Amino acid sequence: PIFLNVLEAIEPGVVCAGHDNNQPDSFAALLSSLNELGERQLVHVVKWAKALPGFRNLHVDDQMAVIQYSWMGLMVFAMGWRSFTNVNSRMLYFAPDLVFNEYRMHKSRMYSQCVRMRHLSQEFGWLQITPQEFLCMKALLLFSIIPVDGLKNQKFFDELRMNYIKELDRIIACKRKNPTSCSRRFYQLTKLLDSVQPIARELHQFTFDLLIKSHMVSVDFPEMMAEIISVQVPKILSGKVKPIYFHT
């Protein structure tokens, strides 16, 4: 199971948000920390992504594009996984030192988006997602959103995507006899991956609005963050870059 050996071997480690719990919760403090966390996890993503099977085959420019357009959905997915394995999707485990309880969910002014994130978190349990399905599914997320015109080398991006889809397909097909369960498992998981997009765009909208008035609410933005939210996110929000859905 070479492909799996690789995914498991290159999975990023535990990342701390550097949040000062001793401080009273406050919109600015919570968001400033999520943005710092966002900036840190972004580093691991780039290293994780580049060590992916057949990834460096993509034109160096499409490597930036895909990473830049899909980090939100990737980070939200993993985070939903950490939540599920730690605080059992009861709360939201963004980082070891930044766990969201109902109070903080309301305090950050994103309770609505958090409710949907926690739902996703529960899905891992309800659907009994295995550690292997999670990894193949999360790889797929990286290839799940592109510009409507196409990347530098679109022909090749689609190839890589096909292979990753075929992998998630084998992961299910292994340890499973006959064929309606497989066919059924594949339907549930592609539906799960789809449900990630709607949540992602909500956060894109939220963070963009946030950055614009950041200096009014005292919320800090790291440099790659403030950079990506105004140079790549705007094109997702304006319909230039679009998610690739499995189902209609």
Added chain:
Amino acid sequence: PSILKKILLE
């Protein structure tokens, strides 16, 4: 970008 780009072509 510029800081992102560097982490990649790295």
